[PDB]
From a paper:
KLHL3 is the substrate-recognition subunit of the ubiquitin ligase complex, recruiting substrates for ubiquitylation via its associated Kelch domain. KLHL2 shares 84% sequence identity with KLHL3 across the Kelch domain, and 86% identity overall. KLHL2 has also been implicated recently as a CUL3 substrate adaptor for WNK kinases. We determined the high-resolution crystal structures of the Kelch domains of human KLHL3 and KLHL2 in separate complexes with the 11-residue WNK4 degron motif.
The KLHL2 structure was solved at 1.6 Å (1 Å=0.1 nm) resolution in space group P43212, whereas the structure of KLHL3 was determined at 1.8 Å in space group P212121. Similarly, residues 296–299 and 586–587 of KLHL3 could not be modelled into the KLHL3–WNK4 complex, and WNK4 residues 566–567 and the side chains of Glu559 and Glu560 were also not defined. The KLHL2 and KLHL3 structures were determined at pH 7.5 and pH 4.3 respectively, which probably contributes to differences in the resolution of particular residues. For example, protonation of WNK4 His566 may explain why this residue is not clearly resolved in the crystal structure of the KLHL3 complex. The binding interface between KLHL3 and WNK4 spans all six Kelch repeats and has a total buried surface area of 510 Å2, with blades II, III and IV participating in the greatest number of contacts. Among the KLHL3 residues, Arg360 contributes the greatest contact area and forms hydrogen bond interactions with WNK4 Glu557, as well as with the main chain atoms of WNK4 Pro558 and Glu560. For example, WNK4 Glu562 has the greatest contact area of any interface residue and protrudes into the cleft between blades III and IV to hydrogen bond with KLHL3 Ser432 (right-hand panel). Mutations have been described at both sites in patients with Gordon's syndrome (E562K and S432N respectively) and would probably introduce steric clashes, as well the loss of hydrogen-bond formation. Perhaps the most notable interaction is the salt bridge formed between KLHL3 Arg528 and WNK4 Asp564. Finally, a buried water molecule is observed to mediate hydrogen bonding between WNK4 Ala563 and the side chains of KLHL3 Ser432 and Ser433 (right-hand panel).
Numbering used by the authors:
A (entry chain B): 300 to 585
B (entry chain D): 557 to 565
Write the structure that this text describes.
């Protein structure tokens, strides 16, 4: 029995709240709060635990990293990143946790660092070709992808996409998306890389496109029910869940999921108790 | 520093 964990976010300020959606029971519940208020953090499930990385505490961007113990319902602090990163991407590749880009409060970041839970250490790997804050990431077939985001050097929301291979320690550009997406909800389902929503300046998107690494091709799929940027994304049981987010003004309480076989987006029948954006999301066993 | 995400500044 799996549950979906939703970690921090804006509602409308940074919060400590960590919620759990129980799929079988169709119910939201609070679990252990973060040690401090957090939004814009990266969240991943790695080697049996949920990790929460970086973010924003309402005043400063942070380099803190916490791990969640579901048995004791307890968050613990582990090694902090080298850089403060907020609106970063976080992903797991070969059992390393990668912290990709983000914003440190002064500048957007092209730098990338990786965490080993065996040694409890962070180290830099190769930087991206473009600095990217509000960057979505996904891992497919041994590669790490950085999708869209915002480049403060050019002041552009990005349609470009880069691919990282740990074996070469190199980032390369792959096919551009059809559309610029900062704050896209990015995830991987059945070997395909999804870019959902996001924005280009004041224009928020409900459109969705999907990337096949085998063909280096993006294709459009069905629109979401709602315009969303800064939504959390996770994949479970053949479906892509998109959680909360905002439309630039309101934070959304709803969740919707994509079935790639039927090409349909469906709203979760029970909203969160309050709108929440820039929340990270993971799926775990109950 | 501005509290907004970079893309919104
Ligand atoms: Cl930020």
């Amino acid at each position: 029995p799996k549950v979906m964990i939703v970690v921090g976010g804006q509602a409308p300020k940074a919060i400590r709240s960590v919620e759990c959606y129980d799929f079988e029971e169709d119910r939201w519940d609070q679990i252990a709060e973060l040690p401090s208020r957090r939004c814009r953090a990266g969240v991943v499930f790695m080697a049996g635990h949920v990790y929460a990385v970086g973010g924003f505490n309402g005043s400063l961007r942070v380099r803190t990293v916490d791990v969640y113990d579901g048995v004791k319902d307890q968050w613990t602090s582990i090694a902090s990143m080298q850089e403060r990163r907020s609106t970063l991407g976080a992903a797991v590749l070969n059992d390393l946790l990668y912290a990709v880009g983000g914003f440190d409060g002064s500048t957007g970041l092209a730098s990338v660092e990786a965490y080993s839970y065996k040694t409890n250490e962070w180290f830099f790997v190769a930087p991206m070709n473009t600095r990217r804050s509000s960057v979505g990431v996904g891992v497919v077939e041994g590669k790490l992808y950085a999708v869209g985001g915002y480049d403060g050097a050019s002041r552009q929301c990005l349609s470009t996409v880069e691919q990282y291979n740990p074996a070469t320690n190199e980032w390369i550009y792959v096919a551009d998306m059809s559309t610029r997406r900062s704050g896209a909800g990015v995830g991987v389902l059945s070997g395909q890389l999804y870019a959902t929503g996001g924005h280009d300046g004041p224009l928020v998107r409900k459109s969705v496109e999907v990337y096949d690494p085998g063909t280096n091709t993006w294709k459009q799929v069905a629109d979401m029910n709602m315009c969303r940027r800064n939504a959390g994304v996770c994949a479970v049981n053949g479906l892509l869940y998109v959680v909360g987010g905002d439309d630039g003004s309101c934070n959304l309480a709803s969740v919707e999921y994509y079935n790639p076989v039927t090409d349909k987006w469906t709203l979760l029948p029970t909203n969160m108790s309050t709108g929440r954006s820039y929340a990270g999301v993971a799926v775990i066993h109950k | 520093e501005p509290e907004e995400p970079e893309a919104d500044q």
